[PDB]
Amino acid sequence: ESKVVVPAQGKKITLQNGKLNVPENPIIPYIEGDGIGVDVTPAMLKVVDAAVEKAYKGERKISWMEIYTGEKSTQVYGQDVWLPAETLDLIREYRVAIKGPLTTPVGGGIRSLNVALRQELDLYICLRPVRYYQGTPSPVKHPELTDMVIFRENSEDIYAGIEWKADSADAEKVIKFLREEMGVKKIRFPEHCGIGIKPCSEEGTKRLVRAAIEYAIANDRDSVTLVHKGNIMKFTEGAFKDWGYQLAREEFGGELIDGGPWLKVKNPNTGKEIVIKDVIADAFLQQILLRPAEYDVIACMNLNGDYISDALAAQVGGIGIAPGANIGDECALFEATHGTAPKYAGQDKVNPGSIILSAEMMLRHMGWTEAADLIVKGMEGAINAKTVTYDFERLMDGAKLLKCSEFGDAIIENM
Amino acid sequence: ESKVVVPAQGKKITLQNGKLNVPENPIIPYIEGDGIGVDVTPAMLKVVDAAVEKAYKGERKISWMEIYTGEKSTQVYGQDVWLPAETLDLIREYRVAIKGPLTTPVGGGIRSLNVALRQELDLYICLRPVRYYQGTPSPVKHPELTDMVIFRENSEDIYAGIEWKADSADAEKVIKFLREEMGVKKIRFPEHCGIGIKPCSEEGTKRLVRAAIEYAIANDRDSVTLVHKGNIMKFTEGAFKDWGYQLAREEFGGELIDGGPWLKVKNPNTGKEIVIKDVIADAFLQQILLRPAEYDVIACMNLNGDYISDALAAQVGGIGIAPGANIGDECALFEATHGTAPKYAGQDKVNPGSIILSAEMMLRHMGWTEAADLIVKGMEGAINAKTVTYDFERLMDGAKLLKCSEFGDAIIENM
Amino acid sequence: LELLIAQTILQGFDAQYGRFLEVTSGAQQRFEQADWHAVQQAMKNRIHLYDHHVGLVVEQLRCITNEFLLRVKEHYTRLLPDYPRFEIAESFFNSVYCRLFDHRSLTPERLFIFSSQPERRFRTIPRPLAKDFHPDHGWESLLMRVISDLPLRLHWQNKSRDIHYIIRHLTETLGPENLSKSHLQVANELFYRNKAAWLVGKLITPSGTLPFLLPIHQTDDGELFIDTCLTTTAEASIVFGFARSYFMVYAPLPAALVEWLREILPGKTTAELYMAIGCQKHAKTESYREYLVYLQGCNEQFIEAPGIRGMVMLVFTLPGFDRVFKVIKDKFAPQKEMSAAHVRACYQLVKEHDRVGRMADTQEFENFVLEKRHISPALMELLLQEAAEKITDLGEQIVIRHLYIERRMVPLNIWLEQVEGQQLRDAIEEYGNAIRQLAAANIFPGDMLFKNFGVTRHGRVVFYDYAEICYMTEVNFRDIPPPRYPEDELASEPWYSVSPGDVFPEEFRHWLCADPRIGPLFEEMHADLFRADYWRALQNRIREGHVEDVYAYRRRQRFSV
Amino acid sequence: GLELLIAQTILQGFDAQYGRFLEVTSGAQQRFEQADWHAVQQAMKNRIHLYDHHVGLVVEQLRCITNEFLLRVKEHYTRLLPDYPRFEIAESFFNSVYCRLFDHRSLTPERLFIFSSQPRPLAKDFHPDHGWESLLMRVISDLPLRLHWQNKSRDIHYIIRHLTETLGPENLSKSHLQVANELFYRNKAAWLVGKLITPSGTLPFLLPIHQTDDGELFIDTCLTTTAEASIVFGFARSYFMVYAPLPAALVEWLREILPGKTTAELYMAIGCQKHAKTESYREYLVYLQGCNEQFIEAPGIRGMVMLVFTLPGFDRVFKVIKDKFAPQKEMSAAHVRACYQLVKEHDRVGRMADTQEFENFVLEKRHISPALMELLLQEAAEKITDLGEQIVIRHLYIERRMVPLNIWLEQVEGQQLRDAIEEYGNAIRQLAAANIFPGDMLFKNFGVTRHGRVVFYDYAEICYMTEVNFRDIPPPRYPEDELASEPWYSVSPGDVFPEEFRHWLCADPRIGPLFEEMHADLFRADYWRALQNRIREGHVEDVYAYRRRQRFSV
């Protein structure tokens, strides 16, 4: 029997025909998480709960129902019931959910709660929006010229873990396969060599790409960009570009611009025109420092995604407050993206940028566009004002240090 | 027969025991290059010799020889002898040489001169060193910190270019090989999919990391870092780490440190401790911005390498003046790293750093450290003086615009 | 000819058992020589012993030849009456049939699943096993015939000392008044295991009949002494536990030895009693039969074993049975990356390893037969859902291609939910104990979670999912790196490259110490486990080649006290 | 015995082959008459495929009947030939069978017809009995075309001028014509061939008719120049479709007209390619007997795709595919053959040399300079087999030898140069309109025919023009871009940018300026788009076989 109680007041979000129908008294399942998770999560709820009321004059309220995974569960459900199957049903039944941090095993034969969650819900797209906020300490001169949102596919890329060790029979078996039947002559140093496999799928590529493009339209972004090292590897990455653009023309009816690949897609609600474009990853990295204004939204292969997303954040000084989510055919789940940091568990020291901001993703994704807009206001005013948690403060000059609980207030003050 | 004089006064660089023995009076073979190379290449001669004259007191002088390739290739040898054989033979015997740029080939099926040269002589390591020259204009606040040298390998990575177009029949053959005979369950989408093969040798890997260690050893560098994703593709990419560390212990007498993988390698030349450590790539990109201080010499796989080298350079605003070279078992070639940029050619207006800068490497390479340094002093000083070419001046205020030929002088005077 | 065949099997058994015995007479030297690599080493061979001869026979039969079956049995059937160890003679027969027939179609008429002969219990035993001893004419003297009594060729140290110990022990146990009236019936032959040679005998008192067990240990530097005297059944049951390697005791005829035992071991069933002496393969049969009685005698149906479901294995039990069945799943959980064989290997490896009574013994079975009537819907759907390749459909019966039958214990995770107070310190102390022994035994458990450990009747804790099982000699133990930077504290993803087969022994804290209640104790007494330094040592000794003393008793009883 | 069954069977086989050959031709008039200029191309495409079928057909018959000697068949078959109007092909048919039977092995005079082993009037003369003005009418009226004319009495007027200008009028009245009953149809033109006879000499006369749209067919020009004719019958152009019930006679007739051409050379033009191969061979055979010379790599720039060798005094080069290709070049071996096949089928607009495949070629070691000898071994071992003093090359082609363009240009001062460039540049265009895009426009891969005309040859990279994307290189986003060695934009296979052509074409100072002068258009995406622009749109560009100037619209 589930230990999780449906809130009496709320109503189920339902998804039909792609666009989810979200009522104004949603029930949003939540997970505290291990470690520092106790600290942050309570805060975000306040911030988020505050924003909603302020924005909609209280007309819309979120009923939050807790569900459990992975440390609490042992306490609630069983000694050794880490990931109760109730949970997976629950997120799926209710469309969107939010997750505090979780413990990721370091190495070995131990399973990972996050992947399992990604894996078992088949969350194929992982979206990691990046934005600078004011006054966050940064390593680059003009970060504020950086609003971007990055889409990656966890499903299919070289990050699929298909490889064979060096001197493993299969590997040599494999090499032989290409070498003799297939006729690959490119390989050098075939003996004592190890092999890996990378694949690109039209279904996979379109699947993601459809995902952003819909996004921009949904949020009135100005362009969609395809990042690929298309030139060296035509077939797998490049086919990414070929496929994605194609998606636009066929599905979204983009009109070519000058025969060069780029195209303009009309935005139905907006009436603005979104541009679709592609640029090489090698170059693109260079480009982001010099010209980050240009790019609003990005879609890219799985690999480019870690490097790029991970990479953008440093400039924006955002790793600490990085936000993330993973998305799927039937559910989306928004998580804090940081270690549990046991040592500081419950102390109140740590700063929950990431988790709130993830909430911020959540709401936009709920179409409650206005409320999330406050949170950004709150986060922005609060940091610029130089009142902040330890992590930042240690960096800045003349800040006023804040405990975790208060900052979440601080955000509110600036709301 | 050949239409190149072999200078009387000069002597052949020679290698015995795999350690270069470079005569005082050396002969070096250079290619003026297409387009702007005429503008730039001559200057380098002026500077290089200057750096050479002052530095060694005039005891040593270089006997330049102009081998030919490219359009000039046509004007002399033939009407379609774009790349005569003699040249290769010249570079191979002579062992060190430098070139202006050659026309990149945009079209798909064309034969590319730049490539052929590296590919044919099997210069498998592409070494680019990135550093900041004072007064230069850059995105990052504190780019003073960056001094790094980057070792990547052209051969043997996804950069084999081994792939099959989706629905290639051939590719479909390959899946079947994998899916059923190999029986991998990891391909979510196996239809309308395209594939590539990424491999890594034991041999290929140690090919360079052996190199880096020597570079570091020769030039008093603090440490060597092996960058890999060995957390998502261990055998293919993970291997790189595993061998590199192994190489260290096995050839270079590396004693352990704290059981952490890293080991400390004594430097035969100076007795100081070279250090070898590894860091993940996606993360690493984060580190260079944040802690440019800690990294020095780097050895990495072909892919990470483009991204990384390409990236640092933006950070120090050196894309324009990056220097590059590629190296080989018994041949090394130092290249200007920029486009033909034909339109301006002959106007003597372009910026000559990367090519000159490449000279340092050449000069350093041959153990004329002292001189090579001189250029550096001259080249940074000239900028800080803010006397510079068209590319910079526009960028940096209160600066004096110098025709290219002139710049060489500025470089020299500051020397 | 047909009757010839029976002779061939029957010749065969005699041959194997002879071999069995010669291996088992080996020990004493092995014990004395102090070579303990051999001793473990020898142990393994026996396992192979029974099979070879069976293996050898069929080939013999095969060359021969190239309806009567009832006939051949009867001939084998007809040669039993004289033969004292008839019982095993059947098994061996049974064992053969199945190999001949690939473990299918066996039926009682077709072969021996039940014994032909009338019950063993004797008019008398041909040579009595144990020798009664009497107190008078001295008692303290009495221990003298006993020790001076026994075979071992070595010197003894502080002999009186040991002697005094027991007398103190019994005295406390019985009191002099009772004591004077009770006597011993020690075994003719010691039972040998591992580092120690054990001495088994009854102790009989006015009150009743009591186990008295002394295990003989070799001092460092080759002197001899007796670690303890155990006079309680509870202790005895344990020392004959099913979590321990088979005793190597020389028995010319096993059946008698067993009968003598029960009074010592009232709890253990026949199938079990056989194991301790070491006839595993025989045990299978009895054990198989014993279950068969259960099936007649209950209306229960097969159900999923309580606990946490298994990613690697499919396991189930009748509600009231004492053993559970483990079937390797057709497709393992995605997170798990192993292959069927490997699993197959692990279980075998365990059978052939000293178990320290931390590892439950296992019995493989093939082409097992189940009656559809028996199998509950909830379970059946599960079997078909996940074990379809293995199971075969046969009308109202189904054949499970591969199986294991093992003792049924309450799983550890469950025990902790139930227990409290002192009892718990009671459990955690043990688990912590368990890992050290196992570790010491050059077995490194993998999951280590409670879901994968079991609880005895005596509360002892045993290890059972052999997923992620490995020697500790092939693992590298590492210390989690101190974070480089203040920023480092918070990274979800470790910033250091981990080679596979890397273990960080401070990682467990999270999984182990989750319950507020459990956590301090582990910390309280069990700190070593998380200290990567410790494990490093354990593997160090082992690499050094040491075998570590294991006591199938509480430390206190150890006769230091 | 069986044999006479066999020999007849072949011989019968031939007859059929030829008749069909005749019927297919007969259509030619109808097509020209009508507008099936696509059909025109095709039929030409099929005709190539006729000879092979029957032959293919026979062997199967033979097998089925199919299942010492050999010679008996030659005699028996051989005995038949006398009193056969056109044996010669008949022989050629024979050999084809034998070769087909034995996978082209063991050829000997003995086994088959390497060497020969052995009515009605084509055209009727005309005289200026009356003023030609009448004379021509007889000829014009006499044509079998069934369409209207304009300038009847017009271009008819034109003929005279060219006609008169060349020779003094005193000459005209003297000379007369000897026209041939059959027009030779090619491409979009129906050509009228005749000798021109006069006191000075007997000289070529060709008039090539044309169809104005919804045509009153007219005559573009008149050609009486000795050379000019050759061009029309050049290798570069496609085979004529002419109806030659007895071929051999025509050949002799033409010969006067085309003094230059070797006989076999003549044989293709009528369209009998397969025979020509036979004749093609023999002519080769006499030559080497004639002189002691070895074989040398053709002068020029060595080929990554192909291996080429020759005889110093020769007119043909043998091109054989290397086993292993240049690393940069990625293309399947089969792919190359296919290309080669294609040109043979595709009309060549006078810009592509035709090729003749060969199988199991044999020559022995005396004639191979070691340098070639190793190179073949080194670079093409799989394709060569060693017997005795003989070695066998499995697959090879033969084509007319011209001097590689790259070679020509350093031997030319400007005026020749100006002419040379002009032609080449045209060269590109004409194929361009022909739907062919030549992969390496580089000179190294075009040749100069004796007449100084440019023809494309290394066919390694040929592709239809409907398989490619013609592009404008993008304007640079920022000033950084001006100086970059790497494209910043997505480049796709088959994306082509013309503008990048300059670098190779215009390297030499002398060369470059003309190209801008004569053909700016070559370097414009727009132009190619326009040309491919139509060619999607049905269109076939008419290719003249004579200087543009000559046509009367001038």
Ligand SMILES: Nc1ncnc2c1ncn2[C@@H]1O[C@H](COP(=O)(O)OP(=O)(O)O)[C@@H](O)[C@H]1O
């Ligand atoms: N002897 C036993 N008594 C009770 N339950 C058992 C017993 N053996 C196994 N089980 C069940 O099977 C599981 C052990 O096997 P396995 O699935 O391979 O490992 P994991 O424990 O990772 O899922 C346990 O969780 C338990 O619930």
Ligand SMILES: Nc1ncnc2c1ncn2[C@@H]1O[C@H](COP(=O)(O)OP(=O)(O)O)[C@@H](O)[C@H]1O
């Ligand atoms: N018809 C020809 N006449 C003379 N030389 C020729 C002819 N065809 C090819 N060659 C020679 O072979 C060389 C290249 O052969 P080719 O196959 O045309 O180019 P590639 O092999 O680069 O595709 C030419 O440069 C020329 O020297």
Ligand SMILES: Nc1ncnc2c1ncn2[C@@H]1O[C@H](COP(=O)(O)O)[C@@H](O)[C@H]1O
């Ligand atoms: N599937 C089975 N069902 C019942 N008994 C079995 C089965 N397989 C083996 N046995 C018994 O196991 C004992 C030894 O057989 P084996 O397993 O061949 O060594 C004998 O009593 C056999 O009858």
Ligand SMILES: Nc1ncnc2c1ncn2[C@@H]1O[C@H](COP(=O)(O)O)[C@@H](O)[C@H]1O
């Ligand atoms: N390998 C060859 N050697 C000599 N002649 C050949 C060879 N192949 C074809 N021919 C000649 O070319 C003519 C046509 O043969 P084919 O084109 O193979 O049908 C025949 O008369 C053959 O004798």
